[PDB]
């Protein structure tokens, strides 16, 4: 978007430095308003361009530079979730989006700590980065809030799932009873 043009301009020298370590080129096209990433002949790792594609997409979603390049490490993955199509009404969409962040950002931060993933809400997309198991949980909970089920249920559900994990016994046994019921 246009509002992201300004930020990218000063932080472009840094990302080209980061990509040059893996010999992948990038270009910030001001006229077209586009970011383009392409490999070279010096590159030896085929999968880094797929990781390079993810980095430019996160920056277009206003994700900060420090968190954005973090996914270049193999241990970290990423997932962008589009929530605009869920609700036709704009007023309902705004209200439920505000429920997700919660008071003072508490519910967002509580989800961030439990999931051990960095989550940012911007426009009609929510960007999450972290371990693969974590990204699965974020998509389950974030999509659920748009379906008119309160976030506090899933956050409290995640906490109870966490406490049972430390317990070595009854791991095989089902957790349906222990999970809270309406």
Partner 1 sequence: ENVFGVCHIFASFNDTFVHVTDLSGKETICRVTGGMKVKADRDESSPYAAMLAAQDVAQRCKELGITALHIKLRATGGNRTKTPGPGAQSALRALARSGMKIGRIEDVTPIPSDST
Partner 2 sequence: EDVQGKNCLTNFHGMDLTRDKMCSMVKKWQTMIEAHVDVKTTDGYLLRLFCVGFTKKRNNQIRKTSYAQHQQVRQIRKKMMEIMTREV
Q: In the complex, which residues of this chain contact partner 2 (CB under 8 A)?
A: 1, 32-34
Applying CB under 7 A, which residues contact RNA?
84-85, 90, 133, 136-137, 161, 164, 170-176
The answer to whether the CB of 138 falls within 8 A of the CB of 145 is no
Say whether residue 46 binds partner 1 (CB under 8 A): yes
Residue 137 engages partner 1 in binding (rule: CB under 8 A): no
User: Could you give the CA distance from residue 27 to residue 37 in angstroms, rounded to a whole number?
Assistant: 7
Q: Are strands 34-39 and 118-122 parallel, antiparallel or unpaired?
A: unpaired
Sequence-distant (6+) residues with CB within 8 A of 178 are 160, 164
Interatomic CA distance for residues 8 and 12, integer angstroms: 6
Q: Which stretch binds partner 1 (CB under 8 A): 9-17, 60-68, 76-84, 114-122?
A: 76-84
Q: How many helices (H) and strands (E) does the chain have?
A: 7, 5
Among residues 147 and 171, whose Cβ is nearest to RNA? 171
The two three-digit tokens of residue 150, written as one number: 């309160």
Q: Among partner 2, partner 1, RNA, none, what binds residue 162 when CB lies within 5 to 8 Å by partner kind?
A: none
| 175 interacts with partner 1 by CB under 8 A | no
The CA distance from 178 to 161, in Å, is: 9
Q: Which does 49 bind (CB under 5 to 8 A by kind): partner 1, partner 2, RNA, none?
A: partner 1
**Interaction site with partner 1 (CB under 8 A):** 46-47, 49-50, 74, 77-79, 85-86, 132, 135-136, 139
């Amino acid at each position: 978007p246009k509002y992201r043009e300004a930020y990218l301009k000063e932080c472009w020298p840094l990302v080209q430095k980061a990509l040059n370590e893996h010999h992948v080129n990038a270009t910030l096209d001001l006229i077209e308003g586009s970011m383009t990433v392409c490999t070279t002949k010096k590159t030896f790792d085929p999968y880094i361009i797929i990781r390079a594609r993810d980095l430019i997409k996160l920056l277009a979603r206003s994700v900060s530079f420090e968190q954005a390049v973090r996914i270049l490490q193999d241990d970290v993955a990423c997932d962008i979730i589009k929530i605009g199509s869920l609700v036709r009404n704009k007023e309902r969409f705004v209200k439920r989006r505000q429920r997700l962040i919660g008071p003072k950002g508490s519910t967002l931060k509580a989800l961030e700590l439990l999931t051990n993933c960095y989550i940012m809400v911007q426009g009609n997309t929510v960007s999450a980065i972290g371990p693969f198991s974590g990204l699965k949980e974020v998509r389950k909970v974030v999509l659920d809030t748009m379906k008119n089920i309160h976030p506090i249920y899933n956050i409290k559900s995640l906490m109870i799932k966490r406490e049972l994990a430390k317990d070595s016994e009854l791991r095989s046994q089902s957790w349906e009873r222990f999970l809270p019921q309406f």
